[PDB]
Design a protein around this ligand. Structure first.
Ligand SMILES: Nc1ncnc2c1ncn2[C@@H]1O[C@H](COP(=O)(O)OP(=O)(O)CP(=O)(O)O)[C@@H](O)[C@H]1O
Ligand SMILES: [Mg+2]
Ligand SMILES: [Mg+2]
Length: 293
């Protein structure tokens, strides 16, 4: 594994801590990192360390490397999870990223659903319409930046948006992200995980991804936000989801969602990718919704 001194942090500077979250092949743990902050007086930075699980393969490893490399070219933005460094030498690969205290967006929204009339929870503030639109607006801003970096995310979803102590949204998980520089589109040529319920039709059969296929995913994300962590196309087998999408089926309007937002959501889900709004447009339309509320 080739060294990159620019990003390398020696693992002796790193003390591993409590678990943050995980999935099938990767896990993320809290840690303390010494030397990240240039102010030497007050220290050490709390970071999140992403690493492979024990049953992970060589393929999982090269995917985590690619993920790390993608974050290197991206550039820093308020609404994008920050790469802080990496331990690539003499030990397991650790990818160091900015710590988001409030976990992922899906779990953040779910923990704020009300109990229902006549019921109370017993042990752990309600979100407003404005809070939720804010969430949408912040992600749209980060995606707008991401597209200007000529990078497509391909896995935009509530489970991949993080929340800081200040309720700032940070897009995370660049596992499927691709460099689209000097490309009109990206064409998938392998087999690997696909986030089916978040994928535009054209991505699902032509295996063709653009910024516009990311916008489709944002639309699904919108639906997640306004159902406070709902799971897309509930009760629908995947094999059929796709005939349904062809036939012009789209998800119904969530109960919290206003008409204006559902139209925004619906525009993202246009059959023709050229008729979906750009992220820049999405930032505009969501700023408006927010300016007059
Ligand atoms: N910087 C961070 N700060 C706090 N928590 C984080 C974090 N990064 C990730 N997490 C937590 O770990 C979970 C999984 O993160 P991530 O999406 O990066 O891994 P992953 O989806 O690639 C695992 P797999 O590929 O095995 O399915 C997140 O949903 C979140 O709960
Ligand atoms: Mg993820
Ligand atoms: Mg992953």
């Amino acid at each position: 594994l080739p060294a990159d001194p620019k990003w390398e942090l020696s693992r002796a500077r790193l003390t591993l801590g409590k678990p943050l979250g995980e999935g099938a092949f990767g896990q993320v743990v809290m840690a303390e990192a010494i030397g990240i902050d240039k102010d030497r007086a007050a220290k050490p930075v709390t970071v999140a360390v992403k690493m492979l699980k024990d049953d992970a393969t060589d393929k999982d490893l090269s995917d985590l490397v690619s993920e790390m490399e993608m974050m290197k070219m991206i550039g820093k933005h308020k609404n994008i999870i920050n790469l802080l460094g990496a331990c690539t030498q003499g030990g397991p690969l650790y990818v160091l990223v900015e710590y988001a205290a409030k976990g992922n967006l899906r779990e953040f929204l779910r923990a704020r659903r009300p109990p229902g009339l006549d019921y109370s929870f017993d042990t752990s503030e309600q979100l407003t319409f404005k809070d939720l639109v804010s969430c949408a607006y912040q992600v749209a801003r980060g995606m707008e930046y991401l597209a200007s970096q000529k990078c497509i995310h391909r896995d935009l979803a509530a489970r991949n948006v993080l929340v800081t102590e200040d309720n700032v949204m940070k897009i995370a998980d660049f596992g499927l992200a691709r460099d689209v520089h000097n490309l009109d589109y990206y064409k998938e040529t392998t087999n690997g995980r696909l986030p089916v319920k978040w994928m535009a039709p054209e991505a699902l059969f032509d295996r063709v991804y653009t910024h516009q296929s990311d916008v489709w995913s944002f639309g699904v994300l919108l639906w997640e936000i306004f159902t406070l962590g709902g799971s897309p196309y509930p009760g629908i087998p995947v094999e059929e989801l796709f005939k349904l999408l062809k036939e012009g089926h789209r998800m119904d309007k969530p109960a919290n969602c206003t008409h204006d937002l559902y139209m925004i959501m619906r525009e993202c889900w246009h059959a023709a990718p050229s008729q979906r709004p750009t992220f820049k447009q999405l930032v505009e339309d969501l700023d408006r919704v927010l300016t007059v509320t």
